[PDB]
């Protein structure tokens, strides 16, 4: 019933540094069209079982969608480190959810190089689990402060992906959706066929 059409086959995905979060509740989700979709590159699931996703009922399910480079798909997993696993989007140590990634080389790629996707490569400290940073303040590297002026020892903390059709498989864009489950005192609301 709930719309897994606004999350998976949507028009335009968001960048990794601003990952789109959608809350879903009061649903009966049919996961035979997801687990056995035969179209997804990675369908990893931690803390839960893909064969038992329809068994346990939860209060809320959060779907976080973004686009990352192909070789960085492995970084979306609990207890990972890397340029995108601590500065853009992190998963909690005790994570119970699923990570679903599929290649998007036929949509998010242009002959001149799509420049509308960004990732952050600088931060004063790592990210706490499930934290979104949008600030474009200039990162400080040296001891001499710089008041909003770029230069040596002062950089812009965002870069764009050089997506092109001729790129390799590892550098091709990949759409990643993370489904996380919340079960608190409020009665459980979402689970599939009984």
């Amino acid at each position, epitope marked *: 019933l709930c719309p897994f059409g606004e999350v998976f086959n949507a028009t335009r995905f968001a960048s990794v540094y601003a990952w789109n979060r959608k809350r879903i509740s009061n649903c009966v989700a049919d996961y035979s069209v997801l687990y056995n979709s035969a179209s997804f590159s990675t369908f990893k699931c931690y803390g839960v079982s893909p064969t038992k996703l329809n068994d346990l009922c939860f209060t809320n399910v959060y779907a976080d969608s973004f686009v990352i480079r192909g070789d960085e798909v492995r970084q979306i997993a609990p207890g990972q480190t890397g340029k995108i696993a601590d500065y853009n989007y992190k998963l909690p140590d005790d994570f119970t959810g699923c990570v679903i990634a599929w290649n998007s080389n036929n949509l998010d790629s242009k002959v*001149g*190089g799509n*420049y509308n996707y*960004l990732y952050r*490569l600088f931060r004063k400290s790592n990210l706490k689990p499930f934290e979104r940073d949008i600030s*474009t303040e200039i990162y400080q*590297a*040296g001891s001499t402060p710089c008041n909003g*002026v*770029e*230069g*040596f*020892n002062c*950089y*812009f903390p*965002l*870069q*764009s992906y*050089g997506f*092109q059709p001729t790129n390799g498989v590892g550098y091709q864009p990949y759409r990643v959706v993370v489904l996380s489950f919340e079960l608190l005192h409020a009665p459980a609301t979402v689970c599939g066929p009984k």
Partner: antibody
Amino acid sequence: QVQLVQSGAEVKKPGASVKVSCKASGYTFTGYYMHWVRQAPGQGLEWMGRINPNSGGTNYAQKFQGRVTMTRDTSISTAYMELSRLRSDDTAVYYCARVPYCSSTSCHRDWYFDLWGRGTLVT
Amino acid sequence: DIQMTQSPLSLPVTPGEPASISCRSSQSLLDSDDGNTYLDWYLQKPGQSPQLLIYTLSYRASGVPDRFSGSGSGTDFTLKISRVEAEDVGVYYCMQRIEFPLTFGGGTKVEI
């Protein structure tokens, strides 16, 4: 075929303004800072300024501040440099150079001019 | 604002003999944080755009033939051509990249 295409020669009267375009071909435009360096006839190279394609923030020299405006267009991957209040001393060849954005953990050690355009003559 | 003064301002050379070009800076280009000296040697041929030869005071650029080398310390820097070839004629520029008014030297002309 990895190249930087520049605008043709421009003749401008004193007191007017000149716009020079540098278009990237064969590489990712947003992976490189774009610098503008001019060479007057009989003089050495002079550095004008730089633009970051990602943010649009620009750093100019003190001499050219208040006259030079640098803009970027990612849809066509072109950097434009516009100089206002032209004089007789601005008659020069303007080259656009590319600089690796960040190739290390310092992003300060890779900042060389690894590619130069063919230049545009402004009179 | 760092000003680079390049010594030979006219370096007549004969092929087969090494040639040395001196460049001097008002302020030391060594950075204590990373231990790197930021001086780049560029070559401009007649009618052609400048090309990169040396970066970070010790490294050769891609496509640079082995006959070139660069060294120096503090403020005194030297570009050395062990074997000068017929195509080394041009103008050589030393550029600093520590403060932002990126400044290129006066240039040294090497012609046969």
